[PDB]
């Protein structure tokens, strides 16, 4: 009878009946002739805007980065415990599988944990001594100089060391006084013919 026409598709098995037939489907198929591939994606199993891809008796999810895992329930977050130290900025890679760190001044290494020794190419000026520190440095100035890199010749004329209105000229750790009429001495402290 009716199974002679080989009606079942998708590998189903036909059984003859009174005035018809039944197809027993392989797992994953349904319909009178097993023509339907059951849509296991109908339950919307993929999270986080992943795409469900139907299979025979199953599905998978293609996740949208940075989500991953069987149902897009995991997230790639290489910057989550901020591996960049000492103020460094964490940047996630394009594919979210790795990170990089932009280090602050003074720091280097993959995670910004290695000091830079500024004294190797010392920025200190005017004979100052360079002291390297962890994440910085310090210049120790010679007499007469100030500033971060001991680059400033100190203004020895402020406050004015010249008494009695004398004019001050700055030098290296020194000041020179030109006295007003009536005054003399290194700092104009001596009066002559006054009152
Ligand atoms: C509908 O969504 C369910 C999760 O909320 C998911 O489990 C169903 O998938 C079944 O799980 C096992 C797998 O082998 C079967 O094919 C599938 O039907 C999903 O269809
Ligand atoms: C022969 O097969 C067809 C389907 O292709 C079915 O309609 C008939 O009943 C069967 O005998
Ligand atoms: C008949 O039943 C179906 C479900 C498949 O297992 C076939 O291979 C078999 O012949
Ligand atoms: C299915 O694939 C995932 C990765 C996302 O791109 C969705 O937009 C798409 O439908
Ligand atoms: C390095 O050390 C500092 C403190 C100054 O004394 C410099 O003259 C010296 O070379
Ligand atoms: C400095 O020189 C003294 C002697 C005065 O003439 C001042 O006014 C000047 O600034
Ligand atoms: Ca029959
Ligand atoms: Ca299916
Ligand atoms: Ca340093
Ligand atoms: Ca000076």
UniProtKB/Swiss-Prot annotation:
Taxonomy, superkingdom: Eukaryota
Cysteine disulfide partners in this protein: 3-14, 8-23, 25-34, 41-52, 46-61, 63-72, 79-90, 84-101, 103-112, 119-130, 124-139, 141-150, 157-168, 162-177, 179-188
UniProt-annotated glycosylation sites, renumbered to this chain: 5, 13, 30, 43, 51, 167
Tissue expression pattern: In fetal tissues most abundant in spleen, brain stem and lung. Also present in most adult tissues where it is found mainly in lymphoid tissues.
Modified how: Synthesized in the endoplasmic reticulum as an inactive form which is proteolytically cleaved by a furin-like convertase in the trans-Golgi network before it reaches the plasma membrane to yield an active, ligand-accessible form. Cleavage results in a C-terminal fragment N(TM) and a N-terminal fragment N(EC). Following ligand binding, it is cleaved by ADAM17 to yield a membrane-associated intermediate fragment called notch extracellular truncation (NEXT).
Location within or outside the cell: Cell membrane; Late endosome membrane
Domain EGF-like residue range list: 1-35, 37-73, 75-113, 115-151, 153-189
Quaternary state and interactors: Heterodimer of a C-terminal fragment N(TM) and an N-terminal fragment N(EC) which are probably linked by disulfide bonds. Interacts with DNER, DTX1, DTX2 and RBPJ/RBPSUH. Also interacts with MAML1, MAML2 and MAML3 which act as transcriptional coactivators for NOTCH1. The NOTCH1 intracellular domain interacts with SNW1; the interaction involves multimerized NOTCH1 NICD and is implicated in a formation of an intermediate preactivation complex which associates with DNA-bound CBF-1/RBPJ. The activated membrane-bound form interacts with AAK1 which promotes NOTCH1 stabilization.
Family: Belongs to the NOTCH family.
Physiological role: Functions as a receptor for membrane-bound ligands Jagged-1 (JAG1), Jagged-2 (JAG2) and Delta-1 (DLL1) to regulate cell-fate determination. Upon ligand activation through the released notch intracellular domain (NICD) it forms a transcriptional activator complex with RBPJ/RBPSUH and activates genes of the enhancer of split locus. Affects the implementation of differentiation, proliferation and apoptotic programs. Involved in angiogenesis; negatively regulates endothelial cell proliferation and migration and angiogenic sprouting.
Annotated domain remarks: Interaction with PSEN1 causes partial unwinding of the transmembrane helix, facilitating access to the scissile peptide bond.
Annotated disease: Aortic valve disease 1: A common defect in the aortic valve in which two rather than three leaflets are present. It is often associated with aortic valve calcification, stenosis and insufficiency. In extreme cases, the blood flow may be so restricted that the left ventricle fails to grow, resulting in hypoplastic left heart syndrome.
Protein name: Neurogenic locus notch homolog protein 1
Originating species: Homo sapiens
Encoding gene (name): NOTCH1
Residues of the full protein shown: 755 to 944 of 2555
């Amino acid at each position: 009878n009716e199974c002679e026409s080989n009606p079942c598709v998708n590998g189903g098995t036909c059984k003859d009946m009174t005035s018809g037939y039944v197809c027993t489907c392989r797992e994953g198929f349904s319909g009178p002739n097993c023509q339907t591939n059951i849509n296991e994606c109908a339950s919307n199993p993929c999270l986080n805007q992943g795409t469900c891809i139907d299979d025979v008796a199953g599905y998978k999810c293609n996740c949208l980065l940075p989500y991953t895992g069987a149902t897009c329930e995991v997230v790639l977050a290489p910057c989550a415990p901020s591996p960049c130290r000492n103020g460094g900025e964490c940047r996630q890679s394009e594919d979210y599988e790795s990170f990089s760190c932009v280090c602050p001044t003074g720091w280097q290494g993959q995670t910004c944990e290695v000091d830079i020794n500024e004294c190797v190419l010392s920025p200190c000026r005017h004979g100052a001594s360079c002291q390297n520190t962890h994440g910085g440095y310090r210049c120790h100035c010679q007499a007469g100089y100030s500033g971060r890199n001991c680059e400033t010749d100190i203004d020895d004329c402020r406050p004015n060391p010249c008494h009695n209105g004398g004019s001050c000229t700055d030098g290296i750790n020194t000041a020179f006084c030109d006295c007003l009429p009536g005054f003399r001495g290194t700092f104009c402290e001596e009066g002559s013919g006054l009152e």
